[PDB]
Amino acid sequence: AISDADLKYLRRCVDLAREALDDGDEPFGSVLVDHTGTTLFEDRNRVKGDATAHPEFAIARWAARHLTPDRRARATVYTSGEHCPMCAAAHAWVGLGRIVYATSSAQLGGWLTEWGAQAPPVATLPINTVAPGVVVDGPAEELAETMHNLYRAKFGR
Amino acid sequence: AISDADLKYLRRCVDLAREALDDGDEPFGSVLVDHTGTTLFEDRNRVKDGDATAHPEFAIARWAARHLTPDRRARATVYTSGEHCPMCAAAHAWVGLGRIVYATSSAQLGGWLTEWGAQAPPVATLPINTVAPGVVVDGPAEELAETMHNLYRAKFGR
Numbered sequence: 157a158i159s160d161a162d163l164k165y166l167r168r169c170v171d172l173a174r175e176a177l178d179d180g181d182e183p184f185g186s187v188l189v190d191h192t193g194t195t196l197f198e199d200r201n202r203v204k205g206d207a208t209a210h211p212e213f214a215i216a217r218w219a220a221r222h223l224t225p226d227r228r229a230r231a232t233v234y235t236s237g238e239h240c241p242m243c244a245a246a247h248a249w250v251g252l253g254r255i256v257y258a259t260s261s262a263q264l265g266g267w268l269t270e271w272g273a274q275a276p277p278v279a280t281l282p283i284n285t286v287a288p289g290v291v292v293d294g295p296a297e298e299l300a301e302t303m304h305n306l307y308r309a310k311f312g313r
Numbered sequence: 314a315i316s317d318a319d320l321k322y323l324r325r326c327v328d329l330a331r332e333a334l335d336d337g338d339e340p341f342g343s344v345l346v347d348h349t350g351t352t353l354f355e356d357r358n359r360v361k362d363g364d365a366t367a368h369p370e371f372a373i374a375r376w377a378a379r380h381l382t383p384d385r386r387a388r389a390t391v392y393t394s395g396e397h398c399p400m401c402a403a404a405h406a407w408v409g410l411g412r413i414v415y416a417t418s419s420a421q422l423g424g425w426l427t428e429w430g431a432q433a434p435p436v437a438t439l440p441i442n443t444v445a446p447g448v449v450v451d452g453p454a455e456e457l458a459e460t461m462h463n464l465y466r467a468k469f470g471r
């Protein structure tokens with residue numbers, strides 16, 4: 157179950173990943189959405205400061221800065237690509253709720269290997285390995301090609 | 314590979330974890346040190362003020378990228394009272410910092426929390442090398458095990 161509504165948000169994350177790519181950054185987009193449906197915060201990759209400038213992390217801090225603990229747990233975080241261990245840990249520490257992702261990090265690491273790309277210094281661990289009690293849906297089969305192409309644009313070799 | 318020199322820094326991290334506790338935070342201290350032996354940055358836990366991600370090992374990771382060069386970062390070592398959590402280990406690896414030395418492991422911490430009937434943290438107690446495979450990791454320090462058991466107990470046994 158990835159709902160027709162979820163898809164709407166994952167597509168938006170993909171738009172944001174595109175946006176990041178066009179500005180010279182890595183293609184990752186993420187979106188914070190309250191239990192109501194109102195979209196509270198949108199972000200994308202900004203590595204062109206530290207290599208840690210991931211949207212999913214920036215949401216985690218925004219979630220702590222402006223929401224109450226009860227709100228956070230009722231929120232959902234959509235993302236173009238599955239949270240990396242930094243981002244999943246952060247999500248769990250601030251006690252955010254659901255995660256939905258369009259491609260897995262399994263998908264991504266496979267494709268990097270295909271392109272002979274530098275295997276990242278952080279392991280492509282599933283979210284549930286890092287944050288065991290988070291509810292996780294993903295990946296989305298409809299967006300797999302789209303993301304494969306997006307990732308290729310930045311990591312193909 | 315806990316050298317005498319390393320211990321000096323781990324004791325300093327413990328002092329910092331104590332400073333955090335006293336001020337009403339969780340007892341975690343960490344210290345950034347260049348090859349030269351000059352201590353570039355010191356920090357401790359700051360989660361009371363509101364944010365559960367306010368870990369000193371992460372704050373070093375960002376300080377390391379804003380203020381050093383990549384070659385200096387790999388050159389550097391990060392000491393910590395308690396083994397880096399997955400957030401912090403990942404951050405360390407992303408910014409390409411070098412060695413990590415830790416006084417207690419997370420295996421130690423989780424085993425105590427269970428000993429005290431404490432709630433497990435929402436993030437799993439993964440070794441650093443599970444998250445950041447190519448980081449050089451020394452720790453734990455037998456001399457500081459009792460000290461940290463008691464410190465952790467003070468916050469997480471009550």
Ligand SMILES: Nc1ncnc(=O)[nH]1
Pocket residue numbers: 182184201209210211237238239240243
């Ligand atoms: N999941 C993830 N890995 C790497 N960079 C990111 O922005 N996100």
Ligand SMILES: Nc1ncnc(=O)[nH]1
Pocket residue numbers: 339341358367368369370395396397398401
């Ligand atoms: N590693 C770690 N766990 C919890 N709090 C911290 O400041 N650090």
Ligand SMILES: [Zn+2]
Pocket residue numbers: 210212213239240241242243244
């Ligand atoms: Zn991440």
Ligand SMILES: [Zn+2]
Pocket residue numbers: 368370371397398399400401402
């Ligand atoms: Zn941490």
